[PDB]
Design a protein around this ligand. Structure first.
Ligand SMILES: [Mg+2]
Ligand SMILES: [Mg+2]
Ligand SMILES: [Mg+2]
Ligand SMILES: [Mg+2]
Ligand SMILES: [Mg+2]
Ligand SMILES: [Mg+2]
Ligand SMILES: [Mg+2]
Ligand SMILES: [Mg+2]
Ligand SMILES: [Mg+2]
Ligand SMILES: [Mg+2]
Ligand SMILES: [Mg+2]
Lengths: 351, 140
RNA sequence: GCCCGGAUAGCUCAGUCGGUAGAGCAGGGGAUUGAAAAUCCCCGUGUCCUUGGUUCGAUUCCGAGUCCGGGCACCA
RNA sequence: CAGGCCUUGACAUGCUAGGGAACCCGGGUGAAAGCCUGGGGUGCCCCGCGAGGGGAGCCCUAGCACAGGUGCUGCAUGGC
């Protein structure tokens, strides 16, 4: 039945976009539109989209009728000789799979996982020490490699902060979904009564993008002045254009200098600063420009879990989907294909 | 190739053709219809077989046209002899195909019409040139 | 930019006449603990900054360099 | 766990149909399981010597109601 689910996960994309090609392949049959150098290119983009929307809905209704015809669950000749006929016609059903996993604006490069603990304290930290090994095996089964950027313990038990980098083809796209705060319910070891306790810890996921460290502010947008020195001096403080002022226009920053008694030792020493302040205000951006690319979910408070893990009754409660697996202990081994299978839907299903 | 002042030459598909993807609407900008070249068109493609059918069009401004069918482009007919699907991103000395001596005379029973020469050998040495276009080898 | 001092275990620093390399903390395996500390025995632990020369061998002595820290940049 | 097979099934119970009602040595094929398959013949209720089949065991296959699980919960429980 594992293809009545997937087979129809692309049976909904039919009508929504179907009648849309009508109001597009109808703007092609008329040249009067072409006059627009771009509104005639944009349309030829939508016109060419009937490529991945006219081959699938076609060779998928074949993988639904060329199988549900000669398939006896009883070993036969004209039957088990039809399975290998749909083994690569089901394995290729993966073409539509990676289409909802490789369509991320930045899912190529390696991902970075920051598993930080939260509510639950002494225990909540233990939670992250599990969710870590949980994501360690996962990425170590699918082939990907790992790089423990950082990892530090603490007081009683668990882990304080654990950051790691994992590679391997199409990686971020697989861990992007598992992003948020995970909850846990089990008998707190670090308790006397052994009461049932909860724990919160977050899992962040951001891909390794920009790397280099460069800023070549070519003296192409600078306005350098040279007024007369100020303060003391002598028969020359009044005569020499010592003081210099370099101006940055796309920013509005201005740096001055009268420290010495030479314009050339001051315009370069006054530049030796603009380089500074800029690298700081040109970086202050990299702090705000990357703090909204990650997302927002991360309070770790009671009432904001993406997935709830429980060892008590023993089951996993994916709150995002509505699904409620029964194998918690099994998941903590890396088995995550399925929650991400649903995670790469709920998430990339609204955009 | 036919007449001008209202014409278009394309190399239609084979089997099915009505939508807009291949060229369905392109012939409509210069004057065309949807009910004249879809079913009342594949009468020839149902005969030419499959693959490609270098049949073209000629407009009159009243749903009329000179659907003069043609023989598959020497670019395609060569992929059959050798086997490859494309030919080569770049021709030269390397190509994912092969074509023996009389391999070029297998098409000699195909291309005989509008090449210019009625015979098979004075018209085959033309396709030996498409073997220096896509790349396709010439076993010998 | 001028002159002076530096860079040595992962952190902060001792050291050699040129032929070892060291400390304290951290970190790794045990011990106590119900369990974390503290405590407790066992330990790893270096291209001695880059680079060239001197030499039988240079961390060491030399000329240049990168970086860091100080004292100067005065009479107009 | 990997691989090759089996579905009322390894087992209980009731029931359904033409079969069938104790039943016995192999042949072929495969790694084995299993799929397939080559022969003896049913005391008997006994209208009855007979054709026949009522026939108790009761095996064979299809069908039904169900079976099965060292799958989860030892903070749902017994017993120990
Ligand atoms: Mg502490
Ligand atoms: Mg003065
Ligand atoms: Mg002057
Ligand atoms: Mg140091
Ligand atoms: Mg030595
Ligand atoms: Mg020591
Ligand atoms: Mg210890
Ligand atoms: Mg301790
Ligand atoms: Mg050592
Ligand atoms: Mg004076
Ligand atoms: Mg108990």
């Amino acid at each position: 039945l594992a293809q009545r689910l997937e087979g129809l996960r692309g049976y909904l994309d039919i009508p929504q976009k179907e009648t849309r090609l009508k109001e597009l392949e109808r703007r092609l049959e008329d040249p009067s539109l072409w006059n627009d150098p771009e509104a005639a290119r944009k349309v030829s983009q939508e016109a060419a989209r009937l490529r991945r929307t006219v081959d699938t809905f076609r060779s998928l209704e074949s993988d639904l009728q060329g199988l549900l015809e000669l398939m006896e669950e009883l070993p036969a000749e004209e039957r088990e000789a039809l399975k290998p006929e749909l083994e690569e016609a089901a394995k290729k059903l993966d073409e539509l799979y990676h289409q909802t996993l490789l369509n991320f604006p930045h899912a190529e490069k390696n991902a970075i996982l920051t598993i930080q603990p939260g509510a639950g304290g002494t225990e909540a930290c233990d939670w992250a020490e599990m969710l870590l090994r949980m994501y360690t095996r996962f990425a170590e089964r699918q082939g990907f490699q790992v790089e423990v950027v950082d990892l530090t313990p603490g007081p009683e038990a668990g882990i304080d902060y654990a950051q790691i980098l994992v590679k391997g083809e199409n990686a971020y796209g697989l861990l992007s979904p598992e992003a948020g705060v995970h909850r846990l319910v089990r008998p707190s070891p670090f308790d006397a009564s052994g009461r049932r306790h909860t724990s919160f810890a977050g899992v962040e996921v951001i891909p390794e993008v920009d790397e280099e460290v460069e800023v070549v502010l070519k003296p192409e947008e600078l306005r350098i002045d040279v007024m007369r020195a100020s303060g003391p001096g002598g028969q020359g403080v009044n005569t020499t254009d010592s003081a210099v002022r370099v101006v940055h226009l796309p920013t509005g920053i201005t740096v001055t200098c009268q420290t010495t008694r030479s314009q050339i030792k001051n315009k370069e020493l006054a530049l030796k600063i603009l380089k500074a302040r800029l690298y700081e205000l040109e970086r202050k951006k990299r702090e705000e420009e990357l703090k909204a690319l990650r997302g927002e979910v991360r309070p770790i408070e009671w009432g904001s879990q993406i997935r709830s893990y429980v060892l008590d009754k023993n089951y996993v409660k994916d709150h995002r989907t509505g699904l409620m697996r029964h194998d918690p202990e099994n998941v903590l081994d890396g088995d995550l294909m399925d929650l991400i299978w649903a995670g790469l839907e709920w998430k990339a299903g609204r955009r | 190739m036919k007449k001008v002042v209202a014409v278009v030459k394309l190399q239609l598909p084979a089997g099915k053709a009505t939508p807009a993807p291949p060229v369905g609407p392109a012939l409509g900008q210069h004057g065309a219809n949807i009910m004249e070249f879809v079913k009342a068109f594949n009468a020839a493609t149902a005969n030419m077989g499959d693959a490609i059918v270098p049949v073209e069009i000629t407009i009159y401004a009243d749903r009329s046209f000179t659907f003069v069918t043609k023989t598959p482009p020497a670019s395609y007919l060569i992929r059959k002899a050798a086997g490859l699907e494309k030919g080569a991103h770049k021709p030269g000395r390397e190509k994912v195909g092969r074509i023996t001596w009389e391999q070029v005379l297998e098409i000699a029973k195909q291309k005989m019409p509008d090449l210019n020469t009625t015979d098979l050998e004075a018209a085959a040495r033309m396709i030996a040139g498409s073997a220096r276009s896509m790349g396709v080898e010439v076993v010998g």
